[PDB]
Structures are given as C-alpha cells and as structure tokens.
Nucleic acid binder design. Sequence first.
RNA 1: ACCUCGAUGUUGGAUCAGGACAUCCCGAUGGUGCAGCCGCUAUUAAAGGUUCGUUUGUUCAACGAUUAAAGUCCUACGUGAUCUGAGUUCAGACCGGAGUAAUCCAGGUCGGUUUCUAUCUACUUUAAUUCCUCCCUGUACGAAAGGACAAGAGAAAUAAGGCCUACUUCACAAAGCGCCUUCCCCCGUAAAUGAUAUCAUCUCAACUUAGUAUUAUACCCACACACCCAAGAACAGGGUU
Lengths: 308, 111, 152, 108, 217, 115
Amino acid sequence: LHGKSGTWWDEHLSEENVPFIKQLVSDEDKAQLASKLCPLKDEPWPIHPWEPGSFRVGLIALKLGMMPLWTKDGQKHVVTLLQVQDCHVLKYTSKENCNGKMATLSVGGKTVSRFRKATSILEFYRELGLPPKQTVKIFNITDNAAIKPGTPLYAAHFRPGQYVDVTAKTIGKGFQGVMKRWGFKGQPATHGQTKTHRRPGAVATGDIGRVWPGTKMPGKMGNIYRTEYGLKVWRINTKHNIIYVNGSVPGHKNCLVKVKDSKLPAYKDLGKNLPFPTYFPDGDEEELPEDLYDENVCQPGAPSITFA
Amino acid sequence: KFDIDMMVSLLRQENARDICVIQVPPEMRYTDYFVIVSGTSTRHLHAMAFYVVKMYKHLKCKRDPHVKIEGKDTDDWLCVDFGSMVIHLMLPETREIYELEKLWTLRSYDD
Amino acid sequence: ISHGRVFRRMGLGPESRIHLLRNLLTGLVRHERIEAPWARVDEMRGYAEKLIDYGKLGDTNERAMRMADFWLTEKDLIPKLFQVLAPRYKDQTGGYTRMLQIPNRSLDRAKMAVIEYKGNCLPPLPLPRRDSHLTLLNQLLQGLRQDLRQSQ
Amino acid sequence: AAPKNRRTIEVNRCRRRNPQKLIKVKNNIDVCPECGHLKQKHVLCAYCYEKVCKETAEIRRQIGKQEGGPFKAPTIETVVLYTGETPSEQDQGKRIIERDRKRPSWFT
Amino acid sequence: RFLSPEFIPRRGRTDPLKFQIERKDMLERRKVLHIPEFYVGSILRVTTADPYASGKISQFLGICIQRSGRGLGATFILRNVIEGQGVEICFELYNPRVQEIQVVKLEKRLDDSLLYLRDALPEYSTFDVNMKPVVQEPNQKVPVNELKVKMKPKPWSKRWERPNFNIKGIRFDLCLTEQQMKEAQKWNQPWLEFDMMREYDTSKIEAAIWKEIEASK
Amino acid sequence: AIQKMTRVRVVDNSALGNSPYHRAPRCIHVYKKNGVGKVGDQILLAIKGQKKKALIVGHCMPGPRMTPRFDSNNVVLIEDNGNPVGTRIKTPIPTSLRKREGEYSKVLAIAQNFV
RNA sequence: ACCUCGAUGUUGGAUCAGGACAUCCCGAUGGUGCAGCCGCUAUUAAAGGUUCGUUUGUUCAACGAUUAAAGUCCUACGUGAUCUGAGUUCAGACCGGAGUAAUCCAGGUCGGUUUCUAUCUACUUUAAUUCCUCCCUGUACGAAAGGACAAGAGAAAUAAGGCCUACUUCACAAAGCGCCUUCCCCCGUAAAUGAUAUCAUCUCAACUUAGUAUUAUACCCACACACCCAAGAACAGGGUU
Ligand SMILES: [Mg+2]
Ligand SMILES: [Mg+2]
Ligand SMILES: [Mg+2]
Ligand SMILES: [Mg+2]
Ligand SMILES: [Mg+2]
Ligand SMILES: [Mg+2]
Ligand SMILES: [Mg+2]
Ligand SMILES: [Mg+2]
Ligand SMILES: [Mg+2]
Ligand SMILES: [Mg+2]
Ligand SMILES: [Mg+2]
Ligand SMILES: [Mg+2]
Ligand SMILES: [Mg+2]
Ligand SMILES: [Mg+2]
Ligand SMILES: [Mg+2]
Ligand SMILES: [Mg+2]
Ligand SMILES: [Zn+2]
C-alpha cells in the first residue's frame, strides 16, 4: 500500500503470455549471440602483431570438473576442465582511466537471465547488443592487444603447452574455528582437558594488553578470490571450448574462473606463438582439430604406450 | 651405441680380475644384462666404475637420463644401474658370500 | 559446512526423522490433505511422490508392498494406496502433490504448509491465479505476439 | 565476565534502535481479489483458507460417520454431493458424502 | 547388457557435459584396449608396461576385490598372495600403460566388495599365478560364487559383522558368538532400506549412456 | 607408512631378522624429515636389543595406483654403508624401487621375486 | 620495601606466539697458523627456520636417534576469565628427626574441589624455504689422500594457498593419509679515475661500477515476493530463461 512493492517479470503476466515471453526473450538472446559470431567482418580493431612485453586478454571459463590425464613419461596428472561459455569482450578502457598505467578489457561469460539484473546492467548490455553475463572480469592489456567490445572469445585463445593463471572464489566454508581455518594444533582430547579441545590458546602476550591486528582467529573461511599460478594447458577441446588446465583450480564446480596467461617470470615471453589479440575462428586460416594436444599427453586412442 | 659389447670391452680394457654376464629373460622385470665383476681392491673398483660411467656419459644417448653410482661409501661392493644393464662390482669375498650367480640363474632353486 | 546436504535434520535423529515423515505421510495418505510445519511438508513431499510411484509399480510387486508396509503405519491405507491413489495418477508421471504455504501457526508462529494429493474429493484450495489475459499488460503482450506471428 | 560499567541509555538507544533491530516494513501484502481480504503474495488468503478448512472439517465429519470406526479407509474413490445434487455418470461406483448445505460457490 | 560401473556417474551437481567428454575419452580408449566385463570376485590377469624397465611388461593375477571410481579414473583393486605375502594392486582401467586385461575366471561373489578377504584365511586369496582361463558359454548368466569364507581371529581391519557393511560372504557363526552378533545388531538402522529419497535411480542415465556407446560403435 | 614404534617384519635371510626374540623389531627412527617411511625409505630398527638400519620394501598403507600394497610392513636389514645384511629376500619386492632416488640396486639384486 | 594483602598461588607442560640480535642454520664478505675440503676468527644479515624420544613434575641435565641447525634472551621467569595440576601449597596418614608433650620440619612417600553467561578496549582473510642426488665433474686445487666453485636439472620434504580425478575416511558432499601451485632483492665489501698531499689513495673529495625498494606485480572493480544454492549463524552474496 506504501508503493515499494517488489515485482518480478512474471508477476502480472498471464498463463498464455508467460511461455510466449520466455520463448521470445530466449530467441532474442540466441540471435544476439549469433550476431557476434563473425567479428572480423564487423569492423575489427587493428590486429597488431605480437611484440615482447605484450599482454593479451584472457577468458572467463566455467569449472566443469576434473579428470586424470597421462603423459608419455607414464606419469598421471590430474587436470581440471574449464569450459568457455559465451565469453565476450564487453568494455575497453585506456591507460589513463584504468586505475593504473595499462589498458583494460572487461570480459564477461555465462549469459544469465535479463529478468534478474539491475536496470543499469541491462542498459549497458543493451547498448553492447549482448545478453547479460554472470561475471565481468577486468584484464590488464597493452594497447597492442585491444579487442573491439562484443568480440567472442574461445578456448583456442589458449594453446597446449602454454602456462596459465586461474583466479576464482574459493569454496566458502563459512565461519570456521581456528583448527580448521589455520591448522592450529588444538588441545589434547583427554588427560584432564576441560572444555578446550579446538580452541585457540593464548591469543597474545600479557604485555601488549591488546591483540595484534592480523591475529589468526576463528572466522569466515573461503569464499575469497585466490589465484593458482603456472598451470600447464594440457589440451584444448575446440568443439566444446574446453581448456584442460593442470592440477586444481580454486572454487567449486560450475563456478566462473578468470583465466589469463601466466605472469610467472619463467613464462614471460611465451606469447610469441599464441594468437596474439585472440583466436578468431572467423579468420579460418586453418580450422583447428577437435582436440589440440600437448606433445607429452598420452592421447586416448593411441596404441598403448610402451617405455621402449 | 652403448651396449653390453661396449661394457665388456671397457671392463677387459681396464682388466677386471673376473667378469660374468647373465642374460635376464624379458619376463623378469629388472633389466636385460646382469654383469658381475670382481676387482683387486676398493680403489680398483672405484676406478673402473668411474671409468665406465664416464664412457657411458660421453659416448652417446643424450636423451637417456644420467646414471647413479651406488655403493661409493662401502668398499667391497659398488653397483651401477644403466637403462638396460646393471653392473655389480665387488671383491671375491663379497661375490662368494652373496652368490649372485646362483640367484640370477636359479631364481627359485638355491639357498 | 553442509554443501550438497539434501536432507533436513529433524526430530531426534535419523530414525526419528524417518518416523516423523512416516507419520506425516500416513496422515497424507489417509486424509489427502495435511497441514504441517513448512519444512516437514517440504521434506515429506518427495516421499509422498515416491509412494505414488511405488503404488504404480503394482499391488503384486513384493518390493512395493514392503515399502508400503513400512511407510503406511495404518495398514488399511495400503489397499487405498494401491487401488485409489495409484490408479488416480496412472496417467501422470509426476507432480502428484500440491504444496502451498499457509498463514503461520498461531501457537508458535511456525511457517506452515498444506500438502494435498491432487484430485482429492475435498474442497479445492484457494490456488494462486495469474493475472487475466485481458489486463493492459497482457493485451499489449498479445499484440506483440500477433505482430511477431504475422511478420515472422 | 561481569560488566565493568553500567551502559548508558544513550548507548543503549544507539543499540536497540538500530535499523537492524527495527521491524522491517512488509511490502508483499495485498488484497485478495476474490474476497478483498488482505494476504501475502506467496501465502494463501487466511479467510479463504479458513472457509476451506471449515468445509473440509464438515466433510470429514461426514466421512467419519459413514466409515464408522478406525481402519475403515475405503478402497474406492469419494465424491462430495450437496443438497439438490445427484451422482453423475462418472460419480458411479464412488462413495457419496452427503452435505446438508448448498454447494459453495467456490466449490466446483 | 553389462554397463561397466565407471560409466554410470555418482549423483552430484557436476554438469553432464563433463561426463559426456569423459565418456568420449573412455570409449575412444576402449577402442584400443579391450576392457572385458568383470565383477568383484572374478579373477583377472593384468598386463602392464613398466616405465621402470625399458618397454617390458609385468603381469599380475589376482581376484578383483573392489571396483571403485568413475569416469576415466576408474580403478579396480585385485588381490593375491605371492610366497605367502598378501599383495593388492589398484589398477587404473584407462591408464595408457595397461597392455591387457584378461578375465581368467569371470564370476560374481555374494558381496560387491571383498575387502574382508584381508581378514579371511590366506587360502581364500591364494590363486595360482599360471592358472589357465576358464570358459563361459556365450549366452549364460555370470556365475555367482556362493562361497562363504572363514575368517581369522576376531581383530579385523574392519568390523565386518556390523550391518552397515552388509557382508553375506563370511561364515560369522564360526568365528563370532551369538552374543557378539546380537551386539553388532545394535547398529542395524532398519529404516535405511526404506527411505525412498536415498535411492539413486539410474535407468535414464544408463539408457543415455548406452545410446552414446552404440553411437561410438 | 612406517613411523617410530611400528612393528616391522624383517623379510630377509639375515640371522638378526630370522632369530627369535621376545620383542618384535620396532622402528626407532625414520631417516626422513617427516618421520613417515614409505617404500625405499631407511629406518633404524631395534632388533634383539640392537640398533640396525633397514630399508622399507613394502607396507600396508596404500600407495599410488599401480603399486603393490602388502599385508605386512616388510623391511630389509642393511649395513651403515648400505650392503644388505642378508643375502636373499624371499617375499616379492615392488619394482618401483628401481627408479626412486637412492641406492636400491643391491636390494634388487638380492630379491627373488618382484611385484 | 615503592604499587598491589576489600578472591590474582607458584613451577613445569599444552595452545598460540609478539619482539631483541649479543646469529644456531640458511645469505654476503675480510683474515687465517685457509693448497683443496675443512675448520678458527671477525664484519654484515633477524626474511625464513630452529626435531623426535627414555628417566625425572621438572625447567635444566644425562642418554638414544636425527638435523642445515637443534641459538642466547625478553615478553607479570609471555600466555590458567584458553587448558592441565604432575612438583610445591590446605584439611588425612606414614618414615626419619626435634620436642616432656602439644606440636613441628627448607627432608622422603601415598591422597587431595582449578568458578566465571564477555559490558568496554583490542582483534577475527596483510613474490617460499631447506636439503639430497645428478650435470658441470673424481674438473679446479692437491705429491697423494682428498675434494671445489659459480651455473643448471631432477627428486623429495616442509610452509603457505587451493582442490577432489583417483586412493583413503567416506559418499549427492566434507576431509587427508591424497593431489595441484608457489615469482626480486637488500650492501659487509671488492674495484676504476683522482685531488687535498701534482707519486699513491675505492671517494664521510668531486666522480665511475658491482647497486638493487620507487617491491614487481598479480587480485577485486556493474549506484539504486518467493524459491533454490557449491553463499550463509542472522544479514549479506549468487541463480531462477
Ligand atoms: Mg588433536
Ligand atoms: Mg572434553
Ligand atoms: Mg531440533
Ligand atoms: Mg585399521
Ligand atoms: Mg639391551
Ligand atoms: Mg622506608
Ligand atoms: Mg578491588
Ligand atoms: Mg650482528
Ligand atoms: Mg625478571
Ligand atoms: Mg598435586
Ligand atoms: Mg599433612
Ligand atoms: Mg614434603
Ligand atoms: Mg603427591
Ligand atoms: Mg585415589
Ligand atoms: Mg578454568
Ligand atoms: Mg567464553
Ligand atoms: Zn481471500
């Protein structure tokens, strides 16, 4: 009666109109996604060649899961599956306004419902001509690597043998005691201990008469952004846009991970052979195989490896 | 190449006091050649082991990983394990007390 | 941490939870409409659906008979389950129950729900009805639909 | 541990009049177009539900009178019929619960 | 129709596309290596290339005591006693270095897990290394070996008598007293077989997986 | 995983290993920064009231796939220099010992069976 | 004998540690009665690290086995509103001793209640290390014995941060016993040219190098019902096409 009623898109729609609206909006979303499938024919920004010190954009993938993988030396590596789902460049900002001195590209992925987004975001995506994305992450790039907003990105933007950094929100474990959160030893189970088995011991000394900032105490654990550095890209499924990244990645299954070329010094200038701005399937220079493998990967279907 | 022929040639060149070779059958999952050699003393053993190892290192097979020298601290028994062959350098008393010959020819028919 | 935990912790433990849900389900099978705390109804809805499936499996099926024997504490309801409810839903594949929120219980202000088996003889619940297709918004959307159908 | 000082009314007001403690205004309340009663959007109308519960209770009392004893659940469907109603063709072979009042408008 | 266990996924929130990809790899490896049908309790001989040697194969014969894992990482652990020393090996089915899997004796046991053979007498784990493969008729249900093993003294790796294990292949009457059995019944949990929400229905999943396998063929 | 105080079985031809004693051989020290011994790790051992080094050649604790898990914590007695005390090893010895860092050629030579 | 005798035993241990450097290890240097390895000594360095057991209540200590090392200290001999009460301390009792006795004892021994629901302050998410093996190389050095630097690769281990494909505890998920990743330095000196003092002189002379923190980054960045959730105590957060 006061007028601040919270409405959702379905509230006043009739039974006949609900399915019609669903179908109409989904069709619009897929049409918008298809419209961007040919970027090189849509006034692409200048495609400069790679130079040393050039940093290109990354992707926003979805952590599908994990699986084993075997290398020709016979070793097993656990690899994690990162699917690129409707990853697009959304925004470009210059060095001056990037909050630093390096250009920035915003990239989004995992299209989401337009009925569940703020009006400002909906307007931004309407101007961009794309359906809204679940997460938008900012990548620092050199001007050489600028890509026109709206361009799609694909798993083949990376290549096997490359090293990558994956950043994501770790699994949220809620308020966790000190033993689980910081690996404190706790106190003995028996031998007299009364009501102290998992408690922090002394939290400080008596002299300071306070607790130092940054003291390890019980509190919320997980659900924070962490980055795994230097994960090898073992394989790329171009058909489904899957990247097979060595080892573990932060966050749960079906969580969006930000994937970028590794910043480790050892992999400083390995971007010579990688698609510099990005991989453009529309370029059609050579339609990539369904699966790109690293040299050492024991591909399935190969004759059983014999260490002769 | 670096094969058992090279092994035996080098060992005879340095004049091992006794040499023996066993052809390990494939079904045994260790190696192809089991060389057992006696020597005069620990100094002689070390000299010949170092010599054969240098020859392996310098001869060929860059892609083949390097090779340990086991038994350096002990004086009566050294051993070097190559990709497909293993050499056991020792003294006569060690050889006669360990009877590797019977072990590696009569797999389950000795004491 | 309870990631992926799908079962509420009810009653005095696991066995007590099963017994509480069993009593609720027996009441549901007997009366075809039951009021109970919302969480308990939500937990028991899956079991109600599974009972309808087991009743569909058939009277002569030994496993279905054992399941019904366990889950229906009053044994006069087992013939009812196998000869009234299951034949009633033979056509449907699911969604045998209708669960709606009810004003909070006056006693302890608990979140309350009414769960019924669809097609019962009882008076219909005041179901929520969407807006009429003749409203202004719905008519404008009908105009969109007709224009889109004509143009494309 | 015991308090070291009495907490002043000023501090206490700052605490217990905080918005986190204030009752929030509900904005999902509306009028039931059927009967014009107030209801929450996601919840059933209290008055309509009371109607249905009372009618259900009467029908169930009739069912109990008809069954006459525990453990007498019928193996056949049930149909409720009000004054001036006759079992239809599909109502054949179903136990009839007879109500002395007239068919409610909301009951169909 | 024997759908190998690793194809059926454990329930979870993981996306079906991950399973499609993993099954694609598993089938495409099966085209190279013939993974025969076998069950917990069947005797298998596994030939695997050793990286420690130089292209030399190693053969291990033993009774499959457990089938675990799903997808490409699926394993089966099989047991034996060599010179009186009980040895178990967990073999990864799709490891590129298993040259062959031979079902020397295809048979099912009363239990889906024979881990209690560790506590059973050594005779029940002993199998001739050079035993010759038996032959089963092309059209024939897999034999179910109703052998009930005798256990060694009570201190066991696990409390096998407890109901939660649901062991049917142990002669408990021989080693445990009626009092001990009654005490073990304190963990019965009879409701656990009747909670209908705990059951995992995989009919549709198996049908889809079979369609995928046939398409791969 | 052989820690301190684990009772280990001497799978060896040695008189120390095979001689009766009122106390079973116990690990006194694991020659590893974390006192957890796996296959290929050395350990001190209290045998017959004597301290003797020995080599782990199998244990009940599961290891990486494709490697054998034994029913007992098997150990081979070795001298301080490294020469095995016994001259024969009867029970199977895992082949994984070969490529592990450290000297194992003597033990493999003495071994009769491999698994 | 200055604060506290108007409810604070004490010692050890547990937990968690903050700090000093007068450095135990790791780093960089000068000298050496340092040929090499090694030590001895001194300068600099506090980023990091600094074991497990038997006896004993023990701090210490001895012993056993290790380690790169098992540092010296302060913090109310840090820390009992976090724990424990083994020594010692209260009421019981012995041994020995003193005392006429009552009793007592810096001694030996057996036993002996450890409360607190947190009002305020404070606080509760701030670029790894070592060792071993190998290459260099049983090369330098050395008569031999012995045995390097520097640089690089591989293995582990630990620490930190994550994760579940496998294994294991288990089971729609949480865990470790499992797996994955971990990135630059710090300055003591040694030199070049060169005056005061026409040589020389590394220079609290001007000047030229080793010489670098001006951490490099990375991370995060969308002003504006109900249900479900890998998000969560509430709240918040994400999804509902
Ligand atoms: Mg503990
Ligand atoms: Mg307690
Ligand atoms: Mg409760
Ligand atoms: Mg056990
Ligand atoms: Mg003694
Ligand atoms: Mg005075
Ligand atoms: Mg006071
Ligand atoms: Mg100093
Ligand atoms: Mg003091
Ligand atoms: Mg005391
Ligand atoms: Mg007294
Ligand atoms: Mg006393
Ligand atoms: Mg006492
Ligand atoms: Mg007592
Ligand atoms: Mg206390
Ligand atoms: Mg408290
Ligand atoms: Zn109403």
